[PDB]
């Protein structure tokens, strides 16, 4: 093929789109609705417009290159077309970036500035009530910002295959939303928030818990515990221009103390708790062989998927609570026993890469004696805004350390945030439990990586067993519908709703579509977690000394008695 772009001749054999070929050759072409190898098929944004000699204006994102093409990307005809489309977008857009939560990383704003477009008439609603949906515990919609780009719809379809996010004909006007414009919570939605990640503007956002946290911090009698997820320490640095794959664990601990938190713990401690219970349960299910297979239950996105599509698998779920909820339960019981705090004055706050964790925290039965396991959940993004509002120089902060009582963790807990992390951590303890030994080779590299479905054979005391790792909600559908589950007898199965694991959660920092082409965000975020595992002295959950102390002095032996009564949760089918 011979291609002419802006006067420059190219010789190539590649078969691809005009957009992709120009990006690879350092030729600038703007785009808006093109994402995840998809554009808005029904109403294309046409921001990727180029001029092909002899044909006219075309969309570069979905037009293949042909030999003999002469292409102009910057002609006056092209720029006025693009500028016209942006101006029409401005006509339906509340353009007040001041108090906007995407102000410093909005894609639409960069386009408005680049082409210097203005609205035919500013869109200024008097009552945003009709435009805003805040009914969900996890997700919120602001349709005064929505560009109808369809990127959230496509992301939902690709990541989950549920299509819980749809286009809707509302009063004869097109919107996006849940089925029959119901609250997302009341549909087959998983609340994974992958739609939010895909959104170029502030139309989709997480349900804010920042007022819960601030009211608690200022309440004199409240003792506010904070604990962050594995993934947060490996990603929040992005929002402070520190780059990708930067471990900022110690900086976060310092920042949380300066925010006014009374106690600094860590969810990885809770991760070690979940392994103690789940590995014991797996070893138990082997003594009786069954019921097989055992599924993990630490991902609420997956739990909802099971409830909504495969309720017969609910009885196969591990009864152990998620690290978030199991940590919260201990924070209202064990922690007062070693602090003398009144349990009702304890207020437990987690930092999560996940929107679905808000729903899990607000489950009705996720409490005991009137005390919630978790009282508030804030996302990575929420923590970042909170730090900036306090004007805390995050990048310059010195490393501090979490409080030891529920802040220590092993390398097994550390890797929870990556896909296959839970599988590997559980095998390290369950294999030591059943064989009654302390094995030294603890790395399970087969269950790692970004493959959608991963499988391995393991030998646990005398015998062979089959494990599988499901990476992404759409892959769960494939595993089940294709009958892969019935090809052999599986004994232990890990399921994560977000592809890549929690490091790619719905509450994570946004990334510019082109930076995504430079950086593999899923592996770069996960590398930090495996790094910590490598350089940690303790790499098994049952070697966690602060955790062993807790079980010996308070809970007893994991998997039965006291431990089973309050550190476990069961899901019932209607
Ligand atoms: N609870 C919990 Fe988990 C833990 O530990 C997080 O905190 Fe995850 C992360 N990062 C999230 O959200 S949930 C799914 N299990 C793997 S990691
Ligand atoms: S979505 Fe972007 S362009 Fe619209 S108000 Fe917010 S920052 Fe400004
Ligand atoms: S909610 Fe966001 S991603 Fe979805 S159509 Fe509107 S602007 Fe696009
Ligand atoms: S939260 Fe997840 S399942 Fe629900 S609409 Fe968004 S992407 Fe789809
Ligand atoms: S994979 Fe992690 S971030 Fe995604 S829904 Fe599940 S728990 Fe939340
Ligand atoms: S980016 Fe090509 S039509 Fe939208
Ligand atoms: Mg206070």
Numbering used by the authors: 2 to 575
Quote the study that presented this structure, word for word:
Hydrogen (H2) turnover in [FeFe]-hydrogenases is proposed to occur at the distal iron site (Fed) of the [2Fe2S] moiety (2FeH), which is part of the H-cluster. The distal iron ion exchanges protons with a conserved proton-transfer pathway (PTP)23 via an azadithiolate ligand (adt) that bridges both iron sites. The binuclear metal cofactors of [FeFe]- and [NiFe]-hydrogenases have been suggested to oxidize H2 by enhancing the acidity of H2 in the presence of a base, thus facilitating its heterolytic cleavage into a proton (H+) and hydride (H−) as a first intermediate step. According to the current working model for the catalytic mechanism of [FeFe]-hydrogenases, binding of H2 to the oxidized active ready state (Hox) results in the heterolytic cleavage of H2, with Hhyd as the first intermediate.
